[PDB]
Amino acid sequence: TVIGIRGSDQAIPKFQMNCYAKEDAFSYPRMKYSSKPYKVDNMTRILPQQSRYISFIKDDRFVPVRKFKGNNGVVVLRDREPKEPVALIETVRQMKD
Amino acid sequence: VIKFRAGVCEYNEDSRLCTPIPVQGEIEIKPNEEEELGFWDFEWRPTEKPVGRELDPISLILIPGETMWVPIKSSKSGRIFALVFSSNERYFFWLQEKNSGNLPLNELSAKDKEIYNKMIGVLNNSS
């Protein structure tokens, strides 16, 4: 999972942080480092690696203190600018939880 | 507990309201929080989005036995839960579920036929 989350209670603002990996989220079932914007960073395939050829945009409201901690699952774009744009996103949690 | 469809609005001691007032959830008039005392703590909770609002003290206390259901008498727009106790303590619970249309001769409010005699009873019920 790569999901915006927050360094706070989560508006789940999602963004694709876009630093290029040779694309293995595009290598995956049907049915390297260019430091270029990667296409799409939000959840799905990623990879621990294809995580780590990508880096955040600073320009969103929220920024991690850890400088792209590097772990897709752990997500949590740390929350720098709430009650604003970077909109809002929710989940079945937010539904029930 | 006996459950009801509304948020917890601005109680609006006076100055008749139900301006939009999110608190979108289910406020539930119920026998306090212990399900024992004649007190009705009005159980509010979303599985909903109440625009991050409650306006309820985890549920709303009620002083029993003088509680009457004012239908939304002193009519404004659609439903609220209009609990008029002293006409001061008045506790309004924001209309969220608007069902069977606004109907006359129950609440004169947007959601009544179910919830009216539900709110009627639960305030006038023995339990």
Curated annotation (Swiss-Prot), chain A:
Source superkingdom: Eukaryota
Membrane-spanning ranges: none
Post-translational modification: N-acetylated by NAT1.
Subunit structure: Interacts with UBR1.
Role: Acts as a regulatory subunit of the 26S proteasome which is involved in the ATP-dependent degradation of ubiquitinated proteins.
Note from the entry: Present with 4750 molecules/cell in log phase SD medium.
Assigned protein family: Belongs to the proteasome subunit S1 family.
Protein name: 26S proteasome regulatory subunit RPN2
Organism in which the protein naturally occurs: Saccharomyces cerevisiae (strain ATCC 204508 / S288c) (Baker's yeast)
UniProtKB/Swiss-Prot annotation, chain B:
Keywords assigned: Acetylation, Cytoplasm, Nucleus, Phosphoprotein, Proteasome
Nucleus found in the keyword field: yes
Residue positions where Phosphoserine is found in the record: S127
GO terms under biological process: proteasome-mediated ubiquitin-dependent protein catabolic process; ubiquitin-dependent protein catabolic process
Gene Ontology CC entries for this record: nucleus; proteasome complex; proteasome regulatory particle, lid subcomplex; proteasome storage granule
Primary localization: cytoplasm
Domain (Pru) ranges: 1-126
One GO MF term: ubiquitin binding
Subunit structure: Component of the 19S cap proteasome complex composed of at least RPN1, RPN2, RPN3, RPN4, RPN5, RPN6, RPN7, RPN8, RPN9, RPN10, RPN11, RPN12, RPN13, RPT1, RPT2, RPT3, RPT4, RPT5, and RPT6. The 19S subcomplex associates with the 20S proteasome subcomplex to form the functional 26S proteasome.
Family to which the UniProt record says this protein belongs: Belongs to the RPN13 family.
Name used for this protein in its record: 26S proteasome regulatory subunit RPN13
Record gene name: RPN13
Residues of the full protein shown: 7 to 133 of 156
